[PDB]
Amino acid sequence: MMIIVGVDAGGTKTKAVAYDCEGNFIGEGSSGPGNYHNVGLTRAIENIKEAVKIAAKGEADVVGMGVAGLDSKFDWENFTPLASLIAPKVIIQHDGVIALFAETLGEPGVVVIAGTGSVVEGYNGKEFLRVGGRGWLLSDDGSAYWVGRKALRKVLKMMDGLENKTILYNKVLKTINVKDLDELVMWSYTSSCQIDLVASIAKAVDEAANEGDTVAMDILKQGAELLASQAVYLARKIGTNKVYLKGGMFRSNIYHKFFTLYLEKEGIISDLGKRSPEIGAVILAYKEVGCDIKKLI
Amino acid sequence: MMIIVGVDAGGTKTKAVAYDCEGNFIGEGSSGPGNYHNVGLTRAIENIKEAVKIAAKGEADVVGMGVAGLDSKFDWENFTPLASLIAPKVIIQHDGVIALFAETLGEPGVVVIAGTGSVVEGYNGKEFLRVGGRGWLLSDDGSAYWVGRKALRKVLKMMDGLENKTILYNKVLKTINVKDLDELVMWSYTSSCQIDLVASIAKAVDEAANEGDTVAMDILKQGAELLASQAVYLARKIGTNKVYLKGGMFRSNIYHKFFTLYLEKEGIISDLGKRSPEIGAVILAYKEVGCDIKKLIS
Ligand SMILES: Nc1ncnc2c1ncn2[C@@H]1O[C@H](COP(=O)(O)OP(=O)(O)O)[C@@H](O)[C@H]1O
Numbered sequence: 391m392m393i394i395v396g397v398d399a400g401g402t403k404t405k406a407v408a409y410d411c412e413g414n415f416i417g418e419g420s421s422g423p424g425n426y427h428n429v430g431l432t433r434a435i436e437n438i439k440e441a442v443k444i445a446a447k448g449e450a451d452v453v454g455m456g457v458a459g460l461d462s463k464f465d466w467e468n469f470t471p472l473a474s475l476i477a478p479k480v481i482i483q484h485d486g487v488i489a490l491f492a493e494t495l496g497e498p499g500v501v502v503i504a505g506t507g508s509v510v511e512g513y514n515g516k517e518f519l520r521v522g523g524r525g526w527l528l529s530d531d532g533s534a535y536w537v538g539r540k541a542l543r544k545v546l547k548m549m550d551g552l553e554n555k556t557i558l559y560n561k562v563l564k565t566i567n568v569k570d571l572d573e574l575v576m577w578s579y580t581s582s583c584q585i586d587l588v589a590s591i592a593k594a595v596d597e598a599a600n601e602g603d604t605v606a607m608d609i610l611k612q613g614a615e616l617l618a619s620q621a622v623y624l625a626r627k628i629g630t631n632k633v634y635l636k637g638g639m640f641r642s643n644i645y646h647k648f649f650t651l652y653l654e655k656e657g658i659i660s661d662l663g664k665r666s667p668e669i670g671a672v673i674l675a676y677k678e679v680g681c682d683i684k685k686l687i
Numbered sequence: 688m689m690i691i692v693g694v695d696a697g698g699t700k701t702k703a704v705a706y707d708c709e710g711n712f713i714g715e716g717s718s719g720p721g722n723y724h725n726v727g728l729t730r731a732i733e734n735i736k737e738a739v740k741i742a743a744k745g746e747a748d749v750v751g752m753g754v755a756g757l758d759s760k761f762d763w764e765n766f767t768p769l770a771s772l773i774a775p776k777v778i779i780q781h782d783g784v785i786a787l788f789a790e791t792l793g794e795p796g797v798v799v800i801a802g803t804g805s806v807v808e809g810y811n812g813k814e815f816l817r818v819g820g821r822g823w824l825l826s827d828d829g830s831a832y833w834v835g836r837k838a839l840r841k842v843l844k845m846m847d848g849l850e851n852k853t854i855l856y857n858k859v860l861k862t863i864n865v866k867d868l869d870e871l872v873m874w875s876y877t878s879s880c881q882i883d884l885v886a887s888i889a890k891a892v893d894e895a896a897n898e899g900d901t902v903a904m905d906i907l908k909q910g911a912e913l914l915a916s917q918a919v920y921l922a923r924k925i926g927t928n929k930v931y932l933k934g935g936m937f938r939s940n941i942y943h944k945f946f947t948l949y950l951e952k953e954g955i956i957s958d959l960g961k962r963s964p965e966i967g968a969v970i971l972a973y974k975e976v977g978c979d980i981k982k983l984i985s
Pocket residue numbers: 504505506507534535586589590591592593596597636637638639641642643
């Protein structure tokens with residue numbers, strides 16, 4: 391039969407699931423990061439290949455992959471030529487695209503992915519579209535990173551006495567394990583360009599907001615609305631009144647509420663994601679080769 | 688014959704001027720960075736000593752120094768022990784403090800220094816106070832870096848079609864030499880943690896605003912007001928009605944206009960520099976030892 395493998399090549403790991411063309415599961419596999427910016431081009435390719443081989447228990451006939459790190463034509467040019475060696479037929483898209491297909495099952499739609507970074511991905515039946523998702527410095531509005539940065543800056547002002555200290559102050563310090571301005575400054579000397587670390591602070595903001603801290607509540611509001619406006623823009627551009635929401639930021643009740651209130655006022659319906667990215671990659675492959683998605687899901 | 692040396696130990700270089708206790712100029716000298724975060728503790732101390740020795744043409748009796756990089760108690764603990772060895776009497780303060788004293792002549796006051804980064808320094812006659820000045824990630828509101836980041840973020844939204852492209856778009860792309868989103872992303876991969884580069888974009892923002900770009904004017908107005916609010920705060924805590932303004936950001940006519948407008952609404956008088964930091968370091972020393980500042984400045 392035809393062995394089809396869906397792959398989610400991420401920043402920390404690569405996960406793959408193999409199915410035949412009749413919706414039957416074959417196996418699954420995992421390997422290191424598939425994002426070449428993190429482990430180099432060759433290592434990234436090898437990891438994707440490893441995951442695919444484990445899942446397929448040998449060679450695969452078709453491989454659909456959602457890859458993180460392809461944020462510029464230059465990335466695609468560097469990656470595509472080698473990724474194509476993985477199998478006789480390989481379909482390559484952004485990691486956000488398979489996350490979208492996991493929910494739309496290959497049909498048009500828009501998905502908001504708000505985790506460490508943020509992005510709004512869309513598909514209109516022919517072209518794939520995107521807004522945001524270009525990194526922590528240039529973009530990523532309302533991501534965990536964006537939230538943590540705002541929190542850090544607010545805490546500094548409290549330390550300066552410009553504003554009174556709120557629950558947020560200790561929550562943040564607890565997260566990065568610093569007890570005062572002196573340790574915070576020292577912390578910035580070696581951690582300022584530590585993306586994951588800054589992003590981890592979003593959890594402290596959520597905790598503070600739940601406990602009644604309006605300063606924390608306001609940060610979530612601003613981030614959520616900034617990202618939600620982008621979601622509305624793409625949804626309107628694609629022609630759908632429903633968007634899917636995915637990512638760690640949505641684990642925050644207050645963040646999710648501000649986000650949905652914004653969408654609702656704009657006439658947009660939303661649904662939290664319920665399928666895995668890799669399944670969306672298998673769907674990406676099914677669409678390309680002609681296997682019935684109905685037998686799969 | 689007492690030899691007093693004022694030193695401005697910065698991130699790029701160190702400047703020193705020597706005078707006696709009677710206000711007579713003795714000499715001047717320069718050396719590398721005095722900021723130990725940029726060249727390491729030993730080399731920073733080494734450069735400061737070199738500058739001092741060159742200006743004083745030998746050993747100095749008293750050295751007043753304004754040092755960049757002492758932004759945490761840990762820095763002071765690392766720096767002070769060795770720096771104190773440069774001369775029998777050494778007075779050490781933040782680089783922003785000597786910039787202030789250069790203008791207040793050792794009297795209470797507040798100074799806003801807005802360049803690549805930003806900070807507000809003050810003296811109340813008893814101690815020195817500070818707001819901001821803790822780095823690009825945690826602080827530096829209204830600094831060139833702050834303005835540069837806001838500009839980059841606006842440009843991205845223009846490329847995404849979320850906002851109309853204005854003059855700022857082309858101004859930014861020209862400054863960092865990129866022609867589109869693809870190149871801007873590639874640029875981010877190698878420039879995101881390069882502070883100087885991001886801050887250089889503030890120049891493009893000023894250009895756009897002078898050509899009437901509403902988007903660029905808003906960035907300058909907002910950044911200026913965010914920082915100005917902090918200057919008002921310190922001025923009020925210090926108990927002064929005047930603040931001094933220094934730094935590359937004030938070279939922007941628009942930024943300066945909005946910064947001053949904010950201060951005047953609060954009844955605060957502003958004033959651009961007029962003196963150099965090294966002179967402020969000499970004043971700092973003079974106050975410590977008791978030499979008459981009126982003989983130094985007039
Ligand atoms: N309840 C919560 N409230 C706010 N932020 C949260 C919450 N849970 C997790 N996060 C944040 O979201 C991020 C996790 O994102 P996730 O989507 O799981 O992975 P990634 O985005 O790196 O692929 C972390 O940076 C974390 O701080």
